[PDB]
């Protein structure tokens, strides 16, 4: 019966990714004084279906100068990790209940970078190499600040379990307690998902197509799905972490609906941000994270260590 | 001793033998050193968990810390070597004899 649950977690996420491509296109169109896809199907509903069919019936290309084994492995790893992201998330009941869910998600997110790294290296192309090195720089920029941000925000929770976050925010949202962190966390997610203004590993204005310039058809499609699935998963994680919905043990549908609405709002927020700002330089992102976010993150970590002790409000779980 | 203990010990032995043999690259030997730290971490963690030594649960963490500095140290040396020769080949480290 667990296989049915795995499939029910996998297939709807892929469909939601396919249709997020559509929403992303239509939102950008209407924010740029145009319409967007509205011809293929009613209101463009069949465009995602059309895009998938064309991509998987087109010939995949294997570069003459590229390592083939790692070239094939990289998109598989990216997509598999993107799908594996979702199993510990409580909606309100996680598929896998872990005592350490935040750590698991953090470690797997760290592992996800090697797909981009090995795609850039295995393609044996100069632009792919530049994109891979930009990915290295981005990860070095963001992981430390993101980790201390998680630690500081979870001090209030008292445990790394994702499920306990619903109990922590039963009366108020976490964003009313740690809004200065949430902002930074938000920006960190934009860097972790390689999204504007931090779309540097796949920068089309400089690197033609970045790390996946040599990829085509199915492997490119899998990379694209991994990107959008990671976007949705990170927005869901932000919603659970900072916007705690109420849960009825006899009626979890209300929690599911509210959580989905918040996740959609955050995803639309990313789509809105992409159409509003220019792109950074990959050294400017590192300087922003190290010279601005790191000192504030350390100070707020000290503050959130001290505050429960000062106010006698330490969370329960040992 | 279970088979797991012998597997971890022989992994450490393999990493040590890999370090003690140099092909051309210093980076490969640094990787072998880091592998030795990983094997030691796994072995000590298994020993501590098996015997329920509670207060020793913190020593693997400390171990990892003193891996990183060491690893960091090695990386620093490597770049200097590169800056002198343009390659990380151990052949170029031959100005000093016995």
């Amino acid at each position: 019966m667990f296989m049915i649950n795995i499939l029910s977690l996998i297939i709807p996420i892929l469909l939601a990714v396919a249709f997020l491509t559509l929403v992303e296109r239509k939102v950008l169109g209407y924010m740029q004084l145009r319409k967007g896809p509205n011809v293929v199907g009613p209101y463009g509903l069949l465009q995602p279906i059309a895009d998938a069919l064309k991509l998987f019936t087109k010939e995949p290309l294997r570069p003459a100068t590229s390592s083939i084994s790692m070239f094939i492995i990289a998109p598989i790893l990216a997509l598999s990790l993107a799908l594996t992201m979702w199993v510990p998330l409580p909606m309100p009941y996680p598929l896998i209940n872990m005592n350490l869910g935040v750590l698991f998600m953090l470690a797997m997110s760290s592992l996800a970078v090697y797909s981009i790294l090995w795609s850039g290296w295995a393609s044996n192309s100069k632009y792919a190499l530049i994109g891979a090195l930009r990915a290295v720089a981005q990860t070095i920029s963001y992981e430390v600040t993101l980790a201390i941000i998680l630690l500081s925000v979870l001090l209030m929770n008292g445990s790394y379990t994702l499920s306990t976050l619903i109990t922590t925010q039963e009366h108020i949202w976490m964003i009313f307690t740690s809004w200065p962190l949430a902002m930074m966390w938000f920006i960190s997610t934009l860097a972790e998902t390689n999204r504007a203004p931090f779309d540097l590993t796949e920068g089309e204005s400089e690197l033609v197509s970045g790390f996946n310039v040599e990829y085509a058809a199915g492997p490119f499609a899998m990379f694209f799905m991994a990107e959008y699935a990671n976007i949705i998963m990170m927005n869901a994680f932000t919603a659970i972490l900072f916007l705690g919905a109420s849960h009825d043990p006899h009626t979890p549908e209300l929690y599911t609906i509210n959580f989905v609405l918040k996740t959609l709002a955050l995803t639309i927020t990313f789509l809105w941000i992409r159409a509003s700002y220019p792109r950074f330089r990959y050294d400017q992102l590192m300087h922003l994270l190290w010279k601005s976010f790191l000192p504030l993150t350390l100070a707020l970590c000290m503050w959130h260590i001290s505050l429960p002790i000062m106010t006698a409000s330490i969370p329960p779980q040992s | 001793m279970p088979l797991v203990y012998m597997n971890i010990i022989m992994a450490f032995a393999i990493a040590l033998a890999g370090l003690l043999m140099y092909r051309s690259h210093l980076m490969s030997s640094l990787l072998c050193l880091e592998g030795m730290m990983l094997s030691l971490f796994i072995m000590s963690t298994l020993i501590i968990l098996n015997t329920h030594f509670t207060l020793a649960n913190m020593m693997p963490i400390i171990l990892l810390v003193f891996a990183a500095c060491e690893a960091a140290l090695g990386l620093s040396l490597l770049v200097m070597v590169s800056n002198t020769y343009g390659t990380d080949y151990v052949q170029n480290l031959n100005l000093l004899q016995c």
Binding site: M1, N5, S8, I13, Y30, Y93, N97, P252, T256, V260 | -
Partner: protein, 70 residues
């Protein structure tokens, strides 16, 4: 329209509803309709094992009340 983006967002919401709702329904169905037990620590797992042993059918969710005291 600007409200023509709504069908795609609605399809997204319909797709994202399925994971959590199906997980909750499967948890109720497999564990007798009462919110599958969470065992974060060994004490809770021991409680589950005791329930499974005393259930007489090898299912932990089958609960025995006061009707087992004679």
């Amino acid at each position: 329209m600007w409200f023509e983006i709504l069908p795609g967002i609605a399809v997204m919401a319909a797709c994202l509803f399925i994971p959590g709702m199906a997980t909750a329904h499967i948890h109720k169905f497999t564990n007798g309709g009462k919110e599958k037990r969470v065992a974060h620590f060994s004490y809770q797992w021991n409680l589950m094992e005791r329930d499974r042993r005393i259930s007489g059918v090898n299912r932990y969710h089958v609960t025995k009340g006061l009707e087992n005291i004679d």
